[PDB]
Point group: D2
């Protein structure tokens, strides 16, 4: 049975990748951070085929320890302080996890393979955020012009990963994934923030939705579809980097149009602009060119924009309906 | 309106201290870690205008600490942040040390730097632990020698000494609270007391049938977190800074905890408990029982919640949680 | 009297920049690492009243950086600190990244925090490198894409982007100097140019007989460090911050360096050089040649020391050192 | 041939330990920091039996990498930002190296032994500074009351080391060494600062010597003698902690009396007190009780106080004589 080690297993992507790999017959191990509260909300339903271990990307010893014990065949580095706005607040921590943390994992894997003689395939969770202000459409070779500490740190991780492949022959691939959402997306990201609020507004638990820049345009796909691409990259004869995206861009305003309209509401009756949600340096327009992924990996997105928006609205409306009962039942 | 900055505000103690200080009229700020999931479960009820504010930071990021101290200009700083689990510390020793030992020094240095650059005065509290005593026999008082038995314990010893040093070398009003074990309905579920009451509730309603534990003979001095945070505040209100043991002065074994808890619900723990060697620690701490005479005399502090009341408080709460879970499971929502 | 804070003051560039700024009437402060041995060899002659001050700090210690920025209140900050050797970076990638990439961000954030808290204005220089271009073919200008070929190079790319981001997001007057290779008689002996001239001097006097090297076909744009530090200062005197390539625009191979150096002393390098595969890098950078048109047009900067003059300057100095060593060795003092 | 790995090999102790172990037939490896300048001054004369490798105690990956490659039989952790005064200036860095760095090495060794099944003996460079203000004589069990960030960090390293021995059965020993000097002692420490200045004053290159607290009392031994004790601890049947000291205390003023008097000078004609050399929190009196080391290890110091002072004065006078020639010859 193939063994996969996933860092960031508790996150959106880790939860879907875990289900995907288990379905493929893998033995899946994940590294999780010790937390004072429950932090396995996304994978509790899955939880001898899935094992969790305490570690941290800022602790190199912890990474090597588990790689040695697990002896994984594939390593997926999904761990990250993944929020752009938050990265402006904690740039140093973000860099240590997103940039240096990736290098620590790469070095631990490289050290493991040398000492044990084993072979390990590696995936780095790259991001379209790396392109920053470089105009669309963005492909694998489009120049990076990062606009946040998070983005710059991902650029660093990208190059550390390319370097380990070129210098050591490590089978390391960089997935340059554009924004991907789902009903498990963090509530601090704009899409989930909108659908969560919409659900609550629909049932009467909320009356206002505060947002920032509605004109930012993004290429939004479904996380469930994207994790398949990660796996596909590691199944090729040679390692390489690939853009994974829907190739269709939409503004936050369009997301609002589709979501609220879907439930028969006019978002303008509820949305208010709060300048505190603006970023110090904005990324105006991301739209990927995923031609390479289609040609080489045979990968294509299955969930389209409106389908994704509506999937998220349906799920968050159900959550809001449950909350309405509780708030009402005296809970 | 006094301003307090609490690191570790999302934890058990941070949640109770926040409520306590807000009740005293403070403006409370807390440092929280960015998380992929919600991590404010213990304080959301509080958060829900401008008296409690949360900010992103990390004890392994000195820049983040100084940034908020400069912006907030706190009058009191309570360092409660820590990878606080002993068993886990053996698994991630390096990370634990960076947060529990060096992280404390980073905060001390950020506070010292802030006071020097701004000319302001700040009072400081370090969350010390009876775990520092380790294998040193009880009763343990402020002058009892430390013999740490885990990376966590050794790191707390380090934080203790860094704190004492900043007080002695720079005159910083820094106090070390040497608190013995304190629990509550908000205690992490991985600690033995909460693990037991959570399991008990589920066993009582039929959602669980076996409870796996390790060393049942370990003895601890267990108090209520709500009572203990009051002592933290009291230390910072004294004329001079000092270190104080905060404890109930009564010890009980894990086995006694089982007796009281299961017996409270008419069950025999021996019917459900099984011993799993995986829960034993590489180096155990056999018996902790504090001598809190100093705290009683100087601070006028005394615990209000006794052992039995604490156990029952936790059992009642976790039984209610278990009943709610039973409804959800039977209905197909869990 | 303007105040400059230089990180990496003990290095090649720091030593020349210090002399340059002192000549401009600056009060210069430098951050140095504590070392078990003396580490001020390049600047001791300068240090020897109150115009050059040294302070202990480390780019991996954010607290130390902010502490000195607060005390010093610099007008200009030059981040020259780095584990600057490419070959070494493959051996200690993690440490290199923490200093070269994150360390730069720590300094940027400390400066940003200082300016926000104090209301002061600070100009900032980041020591970028042509190594960032990696395998991207020459000539390389400010807009040439980066394709780093070492952990060091990737880390410098990171520092470059963190710096650009602080300029764009916060309006910090931060400039990236994209300097191509620059040498001098103070160049580290582990870099190829100094390794060659040091060995040549010893070979000329009979203290050494073989010179082991790696890839002789690698081509570099080599300028004089003394000329380049002037460009750093010039960037910070402009109306607005920007990034600039600083180079001679002429490339030469390691083999040409050998031809010029050994030939200058009437020797045939082929009689002494041997190739040792251990000196080859896991991923090589084949050809760097800068396009410094922007620097020439905007800064009015132009290199004064050409390739041959630079090689001879280094050979002359290292021959003198070798002669001194010969005396000591023959006399039993070495 | 036994293999030893020494961290801090470029320091005073590492240089003497290297010579001692090589004399015992060991293959010695040392970890050194990359430096912009020469940093092997103390071991250049020694430099296939001595190998140096780049690493850093703040980089766990580097430590494990070399332990795996070298497969040492004995590990001596001598690496540290070892100056007390300096520790008040850079407390965070000092702690990361002296406290956490020791734990990183312990964990790397432990991880190595588990993954490889090998056995490794370990030595931690403890210090009498850990006792701080606790009154003398100080023995192995004397309570610690550290008076500096450096001291507190050593206390931490001490306990991390004791814990690895107690929890994992690691053969780890803590050498609680009292102050030890030599002609290789760092010039920023009081003894070497005095003898270096004395030599220069004697030849006319210096006229004043600025010092701080002359009433501090220390137990001063010879570094060459002390490294033997380190080795001896690792040769015992069981691991333990041992105080290594001369059991005789002297004030800085007495050191001045002996040193300057030795060359026929009156130190009062040259010494001036500069308050900047006072420490925020002073350690007044250290005097060790090395009974255990004598009884168990059979260790006893060979170089006494005055012998040590005079050894240092002789060496630094020669150095000053060489400098006088150079400064004179126009160099
Ligand atoms: N989703 C997107 O649209 C895009 C995301 N990415 C990247 O892909 C990856 C997955 O994204 P996504 O699932 O949405 O992200 P999430 O924020 O949902 O999950 C992040 C994961 O990283 C973990 N983590 C954070 N810090 C550390 C640390 N110091 N040590 C160990 N683990 C840590 C988190 O743990 P915890 O639960 O404890 O916080 C969580 O498991 C990330 O690297 C992200 O940056 C790339 C392109 C676009
Ligand atoms: N409770 C006891 O019986 C005793 C506890 N102590 C100590 O007192 C303090 C409070 O304990 P308690 O509330 O039960 O502990 P918890 O484990 O419940 O809470 C720990 C807190 O620290 C935070 N934290 C952890 N790591 C970091 C980090 N790197 N940066 C910032 N914050 C971080 C946690 O955040 P997150 O929610 O993100 O994990 C949480 O807010 C701790 O220091 C503990 O060690 C002392 C004596 C006895
Ligand atoms: N020289 C060149 O050809 C090129 C160099 N560069 C870059 O320009 C800068 C200057 O180069 P150059 O003078 O030759 O480099 P050097 O290697 O000579 O000097 C590096 C300096 O950084 C210090 N330093 C290293 N690590 C740390 C740390 N953790 N904390 C604090 N200080 C530290 C060194 O101190 P110590 O003396 O203690 O080691 C030294 O002062 C560097 O950033 C280099 O990467 C850019 C383009 C080309
Ligand atoms: N000497 C004494 O009187 C006493 C000393 N001690 C301790 O014993 C040990 C040896 O002392 P001594 O030789 O005088 O000390 P030194 O200061 O002479 O040497 C310290 C050594 O540690 C190295 N080092 C420092 N920081 C790091 C780092 N981050 N990573 C790797 N190596 C590093 C130094 O390298 P570099 O050369 O690059 O600076 C040097 O090799 C130290 O741990 C010291 O604290 C204990 C009791 C008393
Ligand atoms: N998170 C967030 N983003 C917002 C908000 N209002 C507008 N946006 C914008 O929506 C875009 C997407 O943000 P986010 O979902 O956080 O993902 P990103 O693409 O990784 O930044 C960015 O341009 C944000 O500035 C808001 O309230 N929250
Ligand atoms: N956490 C935990 N502790 C257990 C268990 N079984 C016995 N104990 C013991 O209970 C005591 C208290 O453990 P814990 O609540 O984690 O708090 P500590 O005092 O901070 O270690 C220790 O002696 C543990 O070894 C178990 O399953 N979990
Ligand atoms: N340092 C070094 N470089 C060498 C050697 N032999 C050839 N070179 C090459 O010379 C070029 C310049 O190396 P270096 O001076 O270290 O500077 P870099 O340009 O910062 O790598 C690179 O292509 C090296 O591979 C050698 O023995 N040492
Ligand atoms: N380093 C140093 N110590 C001094 C000086 N003047 C007095 N001392 C004292 O001498 C004692 C020994 O200092 P040091 O040699 O640095 O070693 P320590 O015992 O590790 O602090 C301490 O009490 C210092 O305060 C001075 O100029 N430098």
């Amino acid at each position: 049975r193939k063994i996969a080690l996933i860092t960031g297993i508790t996150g959106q992507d880790g939860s879907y990748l875990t289900e995907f790999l288990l379905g493929k017959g893998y033995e899946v191990h994940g590294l999780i951070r010790r937390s004072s509260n429950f932090n396995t909300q996304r994978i509790n339903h899955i939880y001898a085929l899935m094992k969790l271990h305490y570690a941290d990307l800022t602790d190199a010893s912890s990474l090597r320890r588990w790689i040695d014990v697990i002896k994984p065949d594939e390593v997926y580095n999904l761990a990250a302080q993944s929020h752009v706005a938050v990265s402006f607040e904690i740039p140093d921590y973000t860099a240590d996890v997103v940039a240096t943390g990736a290098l620590r994992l790469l070095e631990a894997v490289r050290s493991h393979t040398i000492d044990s003689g084993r072979t390990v395939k590696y995936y780095q969770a790259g991001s379209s955020e790396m392109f920053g202000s470089t105009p669309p459409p963005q492909s694998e070779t489009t120049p990076f012009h990062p606009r946040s500490p998070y983005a710059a740190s991902k650029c660093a991780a990208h190059w550390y990963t390319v370097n380990y492949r070129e210098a050591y022959g490590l089978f390391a691939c960089n997935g340059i994934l554009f924004n991907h959402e789902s009903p498990r997306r963090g509530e601090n990201f704009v899409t989930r923030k909108i659908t969560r609020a919409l659900g609550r507004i629909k049932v009467g638990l909320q009356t206002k939705l505060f947002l920032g820049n509605l004109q930012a345009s993004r290429d939004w796909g479904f996380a469930g579809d994207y994790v398949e691409a990660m796996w596909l990259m590691l199944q090729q004869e040679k390692p390489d980097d690939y853009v994974v995206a829907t190739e269709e861009g939409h503004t936050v305003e369009e997301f609002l149009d589709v979501s609220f309209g879907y439930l028969g509401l006019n978002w303008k009756d509820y949305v208010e602009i709060d300048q505190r949600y603006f970023r110090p340096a904005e990324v105006d327009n991301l739209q990927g060119d995923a031609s390479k992924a289609k040609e080489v990996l045979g990968w294509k997105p299955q969930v389209g924009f409106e389908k994704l928006v509506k999937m998220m609205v349906d799920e968050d409306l159900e959550l809001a309906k449950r909350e309405k009962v509780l708030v009402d039942a005296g809970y």
